[PDB]
Amino acid sequence: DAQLRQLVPAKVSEDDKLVEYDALLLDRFLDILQDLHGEDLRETVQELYELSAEYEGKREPSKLEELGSVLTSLDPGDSIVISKAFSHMLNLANLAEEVQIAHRRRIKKLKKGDFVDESSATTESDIEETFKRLVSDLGKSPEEIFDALKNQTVDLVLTAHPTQSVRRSLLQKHGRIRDCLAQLYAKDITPDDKQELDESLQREIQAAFRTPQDEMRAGMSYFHETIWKGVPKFLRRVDTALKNIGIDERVPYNAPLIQFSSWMGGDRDGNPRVTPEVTRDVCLLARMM
Amino acid sequence: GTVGRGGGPTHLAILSQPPDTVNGSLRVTVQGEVIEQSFGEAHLCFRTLQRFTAATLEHGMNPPISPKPEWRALLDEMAVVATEEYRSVVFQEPRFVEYFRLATPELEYGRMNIIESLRAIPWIFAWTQTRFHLPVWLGFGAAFRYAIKKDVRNLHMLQDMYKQWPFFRVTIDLIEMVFAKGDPGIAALYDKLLVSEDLWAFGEKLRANFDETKNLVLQTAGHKDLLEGDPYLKQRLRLRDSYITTLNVCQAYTLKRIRDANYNVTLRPHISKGLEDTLILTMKGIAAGLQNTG
């Protein structure tokens, strides 16, 4: 299970659980692999994993050739299963990262008090910390901050995924995996709750494992999952930060502080598949959504 | 760009914009390979919206320092040197394109899957796949080497720039992130399997460039190791590498099995209860594993 622990021997924060998340996900996925394709398949996948984890430990080129002698001996059908498996393991590792990042508690005494703090989420200023530095270090007034805020726009332009457009229902499966991971390590979790969260996690891992208009609909998937509700949640936080520097007004609700744009079905540069009809379609799709 | 990294690095990237280039109006591409990390999880979405909003507001009530005259002058010269080296490899080597078509899956990307004539996304994609990342770092090596030879005090000036000038710090930080996603040993494997022997010397020359450039980048950043200042990112990348390495080896041999009609393999009897489908799976998985570079 561990060996991961040998890849990454130290914790990076006291609430660092990333190795544990990965060991858990890997352990359950391998059981699922065995259930679906047999113990021999599972043992081969497990062998390849050990070989490449050994490679990460010292980076001997001979370990890559051991990897190759196994991989090159696989017929096409086994090659698909193995490459699917390691792709899915990567997806699970990224879900674990997201959970870890989402719940890494802020340590204020990690801040250096300079601009390098802004290169990491562990030290960057949130919106109120930004307000407070502008007031105390730059002598800006809360009215000046409020006035600039009212007139500002952040415009985020969504572009298509260059390799994989992920459908909304897969995103939901991924969110349930994340939710199970987060709850499984909660403080006073009951044994039966934990048992049921484990069984839920196993079934969602398995469910997940098993045209320009299409690309656009896929790419519009983040609005319903997070952005639709995320935008007013953050704007409410700006209001809270405003009160805490002495501005009792909320940000006016029609101020375009945040806007979203899109290239999906509009960028025809070197892409004859983006036709005038594609453009009409994505405009109607967006309005329907 | 550095503003396209998402995560925390985007925050300083925005603040590092030249003074008065934001002025209350930020317009930024959210790259497809980054959108899941930027918006997939609700807390991360909130924090993406927050850092764009906060950095936009702060910039231009708080522009970054303007570069010292000697910093300007050194970069003006380094830019000439770096462009010359980059162009001498990418456009003026008569066999570069040939090597490019062998050493990377670029042709197989460009018949499915989504040099002056090549689009930028395939250019970045091809060298990302083989963990070599030539488009991102090529030219830094000659530039840094030139600068330290030109005047021995430029070593210390480059380090002051990295410490003091947000533009230069975020520029180096991105190179360092991409080097941490690189492995010239895996690139060498693509050469061994896919590149004719008369081009192996060329490939090895590029990898010596990779290594020298990496060390010049580390020296400018004051780091003994990659991502020394970011152990959180270093941990995340380390935990990805095993799965990506497996897909790399699989992709390299699969490409040889697809391309070379005379490459003989001994199959083992079927284990599980086209090779192109495998190639496609390795491309999607490797890209998912490496996300944003340059």
Next chain:
Amino acid sequence: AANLYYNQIENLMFELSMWRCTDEFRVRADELHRNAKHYIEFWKTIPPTEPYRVILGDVRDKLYHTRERSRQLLSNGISDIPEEATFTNVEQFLEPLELCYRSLCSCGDSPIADGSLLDFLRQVSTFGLSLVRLDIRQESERHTDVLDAITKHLDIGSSYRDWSEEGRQEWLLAELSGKRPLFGPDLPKTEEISDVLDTFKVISELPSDCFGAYIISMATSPSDVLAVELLQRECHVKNPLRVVPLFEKLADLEAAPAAVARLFSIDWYKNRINGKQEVMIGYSDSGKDAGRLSAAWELYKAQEELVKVAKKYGVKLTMFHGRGGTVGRGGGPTHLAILSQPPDTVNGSLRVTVQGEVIEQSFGEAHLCFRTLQRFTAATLEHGMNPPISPKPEWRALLDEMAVVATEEYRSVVFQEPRFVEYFRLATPELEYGRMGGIESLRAIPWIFAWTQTRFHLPVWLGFGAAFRYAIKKDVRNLHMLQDMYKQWPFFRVTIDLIEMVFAKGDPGIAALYDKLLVSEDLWAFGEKLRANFDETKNLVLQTAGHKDLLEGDPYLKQRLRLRDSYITTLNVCQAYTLKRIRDANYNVTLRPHISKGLEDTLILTMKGIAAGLQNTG
């Protein structure tokens, strides 16, 4: 100390037989006729007609009891002698002596007072009750470990080691500003952590006259100093030791002035230090990081900058010179070395390491001892009223450039050559020094020791070669500038003089012998390259000095070294072959039948003999 005073006080008694004294003195001697048991020669009952003997006889009794109480407390932890029967502070000791002094002077006997009694008063004032003040030194990281265990036990999501420098300062200053105790036996302690805290405990229980500076090795940051200040207070050191950062690496020196300025700007620390600060530099330490030339020039400049910081904040700065510098040579060369300090870096307060390999030459013979005290005292006084010339702008610029070249050459050999440590372990008795990481983790003393033994001295000269070569190539008139600097600039002249002295102790032929017998032949090309560097570096040093031969300007030292060499060479040859006989199980020798009436013992003898022969280098 008590024994030395006790073996001297009877001589004062014998001599001060006078009967004339002041009314105050008579009063004091009349009492003491009832508030000679223990004595060395002076056995008789002291009559009241000898008042000075009555006073001094009571001092003798206190000194005996002081000596014996310390002997018992040391030997069996316990003493039946009450502290009130002893001298526990130097004021108690000085009082009756100064009484004797003023009484004699008041009665017309000031010539007598200015004899042995004055000598004795100066001894008490010089040596106190301890002879020496003891410095305590410990690594910064060991203090960080203590504070990490303490904060981790607070269970607040993170601990001291995680925090940024600014975060650490914030926590330290809130602790220091507050009244809340830091401790309780509620603390899980490792061995090392108990050692740190028990060290402070021992300090807290002993007289404050016993101690000098608390030195922090590998110091970088204000928190390093505040951490010790906090731990001293919380371990109940009632009179805390002054805290002295030792900045070792070149990057640490570059950051030292801003670190010291931050400390001085902190109200609690400013109040704590009462207008005084000591900072330690370590020449051998910094030369191991970056090469000797670059360490020497960066140390010159770091002291310039520290003086500016000290002046801005109104603090009296004392520089503590650690081993390896020109001030550590002893003899005459030390005199110019002190005078060569940057302006205002001395300011009436010189603190210098007396290296163990130099102490015999500095103090063993009574005339040399006198002349050592004299040159330290004379040069210290002169420097404050006669600073050396400040360098010309072009000298600084050239040195700024040479330092980059020299460090690059030094580090390319010592840290970048993949097989350097391998070669180092073979060509050198370094591993055998320890028996009885790489170079970064290796201490500075073994580093210098190892190459001293083979007469190669690589740590001292490596990097001067590339630097001089670069300078001469860059502009043909730099050779004349380097020679003008040697002629006109004390800092540059003493720097080069030390290098020339070390070359005079070197022999690449002997070093080549160690290679032949001990180094894999695949590394013989490497050693040969180093020896070619040795020779080129030596000749460029000689060119800078305007010398055709080593020590051309010092025939006295040249004669001395030449007369040692034949014995040292014998020990070198013996050590090289003895190392081969110890290491290589396949090395065959034909013994001759035993001549006179383990090989490890011979190895040890050669190492001690060679070190005694070569004394100080870098």
